[PDB]
Structures are given as structure tokens and as C-alpha cells.
Amino acid sequence: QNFLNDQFVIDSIVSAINPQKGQAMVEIGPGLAALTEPVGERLDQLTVIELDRDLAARLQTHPFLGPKLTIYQQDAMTFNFGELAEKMGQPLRVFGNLPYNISTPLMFHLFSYTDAIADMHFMLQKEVVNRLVAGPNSKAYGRLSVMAQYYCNVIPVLEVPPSAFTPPPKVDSAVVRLVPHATMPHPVKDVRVLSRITTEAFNQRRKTIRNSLGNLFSVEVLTGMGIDPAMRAENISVAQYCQMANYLAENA
Numbered sequence: 001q002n003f004l005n006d007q008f009v010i011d012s013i014v015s016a017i018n019p020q021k022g023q024a025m026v027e028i029g030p031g032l033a034a035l036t037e038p039v040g041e042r043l044d045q046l047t048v049i050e051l052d053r054d055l056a057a058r059l060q061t062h063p064f065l066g067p068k069l070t071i072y073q074q075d076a077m078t079f080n081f082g083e084l085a086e087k088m089g090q091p092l093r094v095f096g097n098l099p100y101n102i103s104t105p106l107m108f109h110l111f112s113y114t115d116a117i118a119d120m121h122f123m124l125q126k127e128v129v130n131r132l133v134a135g136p137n138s139k140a141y142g143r144l145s146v147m148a149q150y151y152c153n154v155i156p157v158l159e160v161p162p163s164a165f166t167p168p169p170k171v172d173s174a175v176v177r178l179v180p181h182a183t184m185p186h187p188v189k190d191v192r193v194l195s196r197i198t199t200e201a202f203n204q205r206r207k208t209i210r211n212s213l214g215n216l217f218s219v220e221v222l223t224g225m226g227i228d229p230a231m232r233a234e235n236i237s238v239a240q241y242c243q244m245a246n247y248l249a250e251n252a
Contacts, residue, residue, distance in 0.1 A: 004034040004097050004123070006164035013175055014038045016157045017095055017121050024088035028076045028096035028106070028122075031055055033065065035095065040065045047084065049076045076106055085116035095121040100169075103128060104144070107178070111151040119179045121157070126172035129156055133176070141234045142205070143198040149238045150186065150194060153179040186242035189249035197244050201233035208232055216248060 004010060013035060019025055019042045026047040030036040032055065040046045047070045050056040056073050060066050072079065085092050094117055098106060103124050110117055124132075127140070133154040134140035148154055155177040162168035188194050197216065204212035210219055210229035222229045225247065227240055 001099065002097070002165040002167060002169045003032050004164060005166040006160075009158070009160055009164045010034055010038065012158055013121070013123075016175065016177070017093075019043055019093070023093050023118070024085075024090050025093045025095065026081075026084065028094065028098060030059055031097060033059060033062065035097070036065060036069075037062075039095070040068055044068065045070070047088070048072065049074065049079055051075055077102060077109060081110060082113045082116045085113070091116055091118035093118050093121075097123040100125050100128075107148070110178075111147070111180075114151070114180055117180055119177060120152075121175060121177050123160065123173055123175050125169075126159055126174040129174035129176045132178075136235055136237055138234070143195075143202045146198045146238050146241050147195060148178070150184075150188065150191070150242065151178075151180055153181060155179065186239050188242050188245045190245070193248050194241060194245035197248065198233075198241055201236065201241075205233040209236060213244075217244065221247065 017039065019039045021043060024047070025039060025043060026049065027036055027039070028049050030048045030050050036046070036048060036059065041064070046068050048059065049072045050059065051074065053073060056071055059069055059071060081092060094110060103122065110120060130140045131142055131144045132148045133156050134142070134145045157175040157177055160173040160175065162170065162172070165173070197213065200216065201209060201212050208230055209222065209227070209232060212233060219229050225240070225243055227236065
């Protein structure tokens with residue numbers, strides 16, 4: 001719905017993405033081709049996922065983009081990216097102006113394909129980008145920071161005012177780059193457990209982890225790991241959360 005319309009902003013995003021011939025790029029929500037056109041001009045082929053049948057039909061008749069485009073008229077939420085990576089024969093460079101509504105579930109959907117994604121460049125609500133990148137001991141640090149950082153290097157790109165879109169959104173936007181780790185810095189036996197620990201910790205972020213994770217870790221276990229039970233969810237590092245996930249897997 002909120003179509004990117006500012007030319008300078010557009011140029012700045014294209015410059016950041018830096019599409020190169022030979023890369024397999026996939027846009028989620030090409031819309032009115034604000035990014036599709038300039039990105040596609042640098043490529044021989046380009047894949048898009050577009051739910052609006054009206055706008056998809058306009059891409060197909062673009063004289064230069066058309067011949068280059070593979071258009072999937074489906075929902076990205078349940079799109080099999082892992083299978084698309086197999087077809088393109090290489091990890092995917094994903095990009096797009098994402099609707100605020102689906103942005104967080106889509107990111108987790110993409111994260112689950114690990115290896116299959118080279119990188120991601122998404123427009124999101126600015127506060128979402130701040131959480132994604134946040135480190136411990138700050139307000140923005142939460143479960144999303146930890147999960148997102150387990151999977152990826154999180155790289156803020158641009159902040160974008162409402163006036164850059166037509167119609168304008170109600171809140172500031174930002175572009176973030178997400179790069180799945182080539183080498184996972186803190187591997188976890190089973191991610192569902194990491195997901196569970198962070199949910200429990202952050203659902204009670206104004207309590208010490210002694211209290212919020214007391215159903216899962218004794219004070220002795222926490223002390224043994226070098227984790228201070230007087231600390232709260234937001235004081236615990238990504239590394240420590242992963243150490244807790246592995247413990248709970250190697251011991252329960």
C-alpha cells in the first residue's frame with residue numbers, strides 16, 4: 001500500500017543493494033516498480049513476488065523489465081525460498097518494501113531457510129530496525145534482536161521519512177540489511193529452545209532472569225555458566241542466550 005516514491009531515496013537504496021549481474025535477486029512486493037526498474041536495469045534476470053494482480057500485470061508489459069522477469073503471483077509468507085534457491089542455483093539476494101503487517105513473520109520465514117539466502121534488504125518501520133540491531137542493556141533489545149542476530153549480521157542502512165511514500169505512512173521507516181552468517185558465531189543444537197528461552201525471559205523483562213527463567217534454570221545452573229541471576233533479560237548477551245539453549249538441550 002505505501003509506495004516508495006522519492007527519487008533520491010530510491011537511488012540511495014539501489015546504491016546500498018548494489019545489484020550485480022549474475023546474482024540471483026528476488027523482490028518481495030515490487031509494487032509500482034520503484035526499486036524493480038533500477039535494480040532490474042543492472043541484471044539480465046530478476047524474480048519478483050507480487051500479490052496484487054493489477055500491479056503484476058503492469059510489470060509483465062514493461063518493455064525492458066518484462067523480458068527479464070519471473071513473476072510469482074503469490075503470498076511471500078509461504079513461498080518456498082529454499083526451492084527457489086535450488087532453481088536459481090545459488091543463495092538468494094532478497095529485497096523489498098515490506099508491509100508493516102507481515103514484516104516480522106516474513107523475516108522468520110526467511111531465517112528458517114538459512115543457507116538459501118545470501119542477504120536481505122528490507123524497508124521496515126524504523127523502530128523494528130532499531131530492535132533488530134540492538135545490543136544488550138538498551139530498550140530496543142528484545143527477543144527479536146536475539147533471534148535475528150542468531151541467524152544474521154544485522155546492518156542498518158537508511159532512515160526514511162513518511163514523505164518518501166505515497167501515500168505517506170504514519171511512522172518513520174528504515175532500510176536494514178540482513179546477512180545470514182557464513183559461520184554461525186554461536187551455534188545452537190535446536191533453535192526452538194532458543195526461541196523458547198528468549199520468549200520466557202523477555203515476556204518478563206522487568207524481572208531478573210532468576211525469576212523469569214526460574215522454571216527452566218536453577219540459580220546454580222546460571223551461576224555455573226557465568227550468568228548473574230541478578231541480571232534481567234535485556235542484560236543477557238546473544239552468546240549467553242545460545243549457551244542457555246545448548247545447556248537445556250544437552251541436559252533436558
